[PDB]
Amino acid sequence: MHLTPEEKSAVTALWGKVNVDEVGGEALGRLLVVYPWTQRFFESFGDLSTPDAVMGNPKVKAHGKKVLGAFSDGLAHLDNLKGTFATLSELHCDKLHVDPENFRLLGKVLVCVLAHHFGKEFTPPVQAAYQKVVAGVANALAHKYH
């Protein structure tokens, strides 16, 4: 991923203020509320019947923490996203059967969550840098699909 040094610092600086477990649970719950067809993977997670039930589901929050934890460690490897996510790509394709469009939808919902969390601090150039990163991660996770 080629970001400018300015873009890298902007991404890095904001991420240092993020509570990964809270933002991860929020991002995954909003994904399941806003784009409900993504619930197809999570039928074992119990009650998803209302937005409140989704957002309060302990299994959704736990998965959110897992997903964003992997995202978070990926941010330390912006110059090598494909290699960092290679084995996870194969697992999502071969074993989990996740359509890579879902990574893009999570990307959009994460940007919204960051804007909601940080308000004016989430400026148009900072968003533009995060747009490159979420696209970069989605592309890396889809790379080994066959």
Binding site: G29, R30, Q39, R40, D99, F118, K120, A128, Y145
Partner: protein, 283 residues
Amino acid sequence: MLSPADKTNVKAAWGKVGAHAGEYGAEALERMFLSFPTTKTYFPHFDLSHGSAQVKGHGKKVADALTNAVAHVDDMPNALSALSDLHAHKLRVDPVNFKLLSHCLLVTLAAHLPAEFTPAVHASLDKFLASVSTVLTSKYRGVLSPADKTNVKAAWGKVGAHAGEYGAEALERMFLSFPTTKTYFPHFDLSHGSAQVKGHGKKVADALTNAVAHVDDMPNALSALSDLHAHKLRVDPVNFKLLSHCLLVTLAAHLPAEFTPAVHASLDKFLASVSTVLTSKYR
């Protein structure tokens, strides 16, 4: 489609927006030009510098149109009829760009409405902006005209008893050309010649046959299938465009005389309409 609770959510959110509509409209554009630079190709006649009067005035125009839409939520195609004409016949902005501005408008509201931007409001606002985008692009090619319906029935008539065979071919073309679609069939043998693919192709073809027979009443004829895709199978909507393309390629390869440019256009409009109906109950 927009439920009454959706409408209530949008009204409340936009009411809080209030007198800032214009400013937020300008911010949404700025976010879009920065994050999605290809959208600048539609504005080479503007000074796109930060704070420029052209971007500010355009933001206000966009925001006013949204205000009009919120106030006429029940009659959107009529309230935005003039704007739909303008984008369809004069500006001719590619429909993919509406999704980009919608996203940037959503980010702008999130950044400015901490208390109001709850999960359910987020869901409602996304749906609202999608509906606006749909209305604004609805005249690019418009409804199926009587000439379209004639062209579709003629081509499908020529398909005839081979409909099943062609459905299987289209699936096979899809699985090879767009491998991500294979994620929805982990329980199938997808190899060439597979009886599971052939049986499924026939089901898909049979459904298209029913849709052609009911072209003026497609939502009701396809209702059980809309339910099934939306609430059980839950296939991402993007995938319907890929199968539609592969069905068109299959017909082209089998219909050398029938696949004229006009019939090509009519078939592409027909499969987009089928795709719309099949995803109509997702949200």
